[PDB]
Design an enzyme around this catalytic site. Sequence first.
Site, PDB file in Angstrom:
ATOM      1  N   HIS A 133       0.835  -1.202   0.000  1.00 41.11           N
ATOM      2  CA  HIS A 133       0.000   0.000   0.000  1.00 41.11           C
ATOM      3  C   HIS A 133       0.870   1.252   0.000  1.00 41.11           C
ATOM      4  CE1 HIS A 133      -3.700   2.286   1.505  1.00 41.11           C
ATOM      5  NE2 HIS A 133      -2.723   3.120   1.817  1.00 41.11           N
ATOM      6  N   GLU A 134       1.889   1.281   0.865  1.00 36.13           N
ATOM      7  CA  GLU A 134       2.753   2.456   0.959  1.00 36.13           C
ATOM      8  C   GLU A 134       3.548   2.681  -0.314  1.00 36.13           C
ATOM      9  OE1 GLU A 134       1.747   4.171   3.271  1.00 36.13           O
ATOM     10  OE2 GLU A 134       0.800   2.553   4.449  1.00 36.13           O
TER      11      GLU A 134
ATOM     12  N   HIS B  51       1.588   4.231  -3.098  1.00 35.92           N
ATOM     13  CA  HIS B  51       1.435   5.685  -3.092  1.00 35.92           C
ATOM     14  C   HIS B  51       2.526   6.360  -3.928  1.00 35.92           C
ATOM     15  CE1 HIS B  51      -2.041   6.379  -0.601  1.00 35.92           C
ATOM     16  NE2 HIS B  51      -1.574   5.718   0.443  1.00 35.92           N
TER      17      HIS B  51
ATOM     18  N   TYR C 196      -4.601  14.231  -2.984  1.00 42.59           N
ATOM     19  CA  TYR C 196      -4.983  13.443  -1.804  1.00 42.59           C
ATOM     20  C   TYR C 196      -6.134  14.082  -1.024  1.00 42.59           C
ATOM     21  CZ  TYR C 196      -4.058   9.767   1.643  1.00 42.59           C
ATOM     22  OH  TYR C 196      -4.125   8.683   2.500  1.00 42.59           O
TER      23      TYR C 196
ATOM     24  N   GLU D 278      -6.314   6.202  -2.495  1.00 43.10           N
ATOM     25  CA  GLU D 278      -6.357   5.194  -1.443  1.00 43.10           C
ATOM     26  C   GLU D 278      -6.724   3.814  -1.978  1.00 43.10           C
ATOM     27  OE1 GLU D 278      -4.386   6.211   1.298  1.00 43.10           O
ATOM     28  OE2 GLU D 278      -5.752   4.549   1.789  1.00 43.10           O
TER      29      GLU D 278
ATOM     30  N   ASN E  71      -1.389 -16.585   3.202  1.00 45.46           N
ATOM     31  CA  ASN E  71      -2.655 -16.181   3.798  1.00 45.46           C
ATOM     32  C   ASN E  71      -3.300 -14.993   3.077  1.00 45.46           C
ATOM     33  OD1 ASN E  71      -2.429 -18.121   5.945  1.00 45.46           O
ATOM     34  ND2 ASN E  71      -0.962 -16.736   6.905  1.00 45.46           N
TER      35      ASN E  71
ATOM     36  N   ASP F  75     -10.468  -9.539  12.497  1.00 47.02           N
ATOM     37  CA  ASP F  75     -10.804  -8.200  12.047  1.00 47.02           C
ATOM     38  C   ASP F  75      -9.694  -7.648  11.159  1.00 47.02           C
ATOM     39  OD1 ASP F  75      -8.930  -7.720  14.002  1.00 47.02           O
ATOM     40  OD2 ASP F  75     -10.010  -6.009  14.845  1.00 47.02           O
TER      41      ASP F  75
ATOM     42  N   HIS G  62      -9.919   7.569   3.232  1.00 50.16           N
ATOM     43  CA  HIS G  62      -9.862   6.187   3.721  1.00 50.16           C
ATOM     44  C   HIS G  62     -11.239   5.586   3.949  1.00 50.16           C
ATOM     45  CE1 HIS G  62      -5.865   7.843   4.960  1.00 50.16           C
ATOM     46  NE2 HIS G  62      -5.458   6.663   4.532  1.00 50.16           N
TER      47      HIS G  62
HETATM   48 CA   LIG Z   1      -6.798  -8.046  14.951  1.00 52.14          CA
HETATM   49 CA   LIG Z   2      -3.685 -11.942   4.706  1.00 49.98          CA
HETATM   50 ZN   LIG Z   3      -2.835   5.131   1.899  1.00 44.98          ZN
END
Ligand SMILES: [Ca+2]
Ligand SMILES: [Ca+2]
Ligand SMILES: [Zn+2]
Length: 316
Positions: free
Chosen positions: A142-143, A146, A157, A166, A183, A200, A231
């Site tokens: 993700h970073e 950007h 942004y 985003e 995973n 989560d 976000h």
């Molecule tokens: Ca967690």
């Molecule tokens: Ca994962």
């Molecule tokens: Zn971001």
Amino acid sequence: ITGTSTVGVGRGVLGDQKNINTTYSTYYYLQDNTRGNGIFTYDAKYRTTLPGSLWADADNQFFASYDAPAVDAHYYAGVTYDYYKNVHNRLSYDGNNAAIRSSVHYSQGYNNAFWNGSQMVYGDGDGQTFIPLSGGIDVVAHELTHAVTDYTAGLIYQNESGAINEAISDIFGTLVEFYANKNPDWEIGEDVYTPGISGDSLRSMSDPAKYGDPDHYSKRYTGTQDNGGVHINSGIINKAAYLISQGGTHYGVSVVGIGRDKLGKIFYRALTQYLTPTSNFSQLRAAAVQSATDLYGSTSQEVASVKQAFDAVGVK
Ligand SMILES: [Ca+2]
Ligand SMILES: [Ca+2]
Ligand SMILES: [Zn+2]
Ligand SMILES: [Ca+2]
Ligand SMILES: [Ca+2]
């Protein structure tokens, strides 16, 4: 630094052992010479002055607790570089093999990570909301994404262009997570978020509303917090991307999935050939339709599925 390329071993944030590309010159440095013009990982030493010092280690073994965020920032930057090069024929974030720099141990209790215009930066978290954020391959990708966005479409942004920005980072973060194939899921940040809560994540692409984010344009946030919801409203585009790849019927609109690889091709082409700094969601739809047309043809299933997915999330 000038030195010879070496291979160290260490343990990441989640306790897993991995090899890392290092450079030897008196010390062993977190400097991977095998990719472009290098991947460099720095110690910010709990401060906010960047980048800090290039990570130096006496013995090329990185098993200390303090080492773990550096191991993962360094290693996952390499995986992300490999994804862009091998899948999209893109050489680093600028397309010209720019050196990739990351700092870990940024600040104290810092529950975030960011690209600062020049480098990636990772907090350690406070141990409650996050553990050190470089432990998430989706976070690292993700970073770095950007930086790719900033060099290409240049999406401002804030507001809709910022929510696209985003979503692009979440999309490619997820596609890198699938590329590494450990995973993999359509959730964001699950490996480093809330160590006391299982199951989560920070955001969900498959069901953004599970964490309060909109999954339809009619539910977009229109206020000023979070740069106009960058976000938050990213959920609308993340859901569209998820539907393009995986299919589904959402608010009664059926989408035929075309798979992750074609999703990535369509969105990479849209990002690099069609989007502009001020693109809004409707303009992203048009960019994705055109990209799919270029790649697969106007009468293709891929084009039809892009249209269905944007219809499903209320973007015309
Ligand atoms: Ca967690
Ligand atoms: Ca994962
Ligand atoms: Zn971001
Ligand atoms: Ca050591
Ligand atoms: Ca994930």
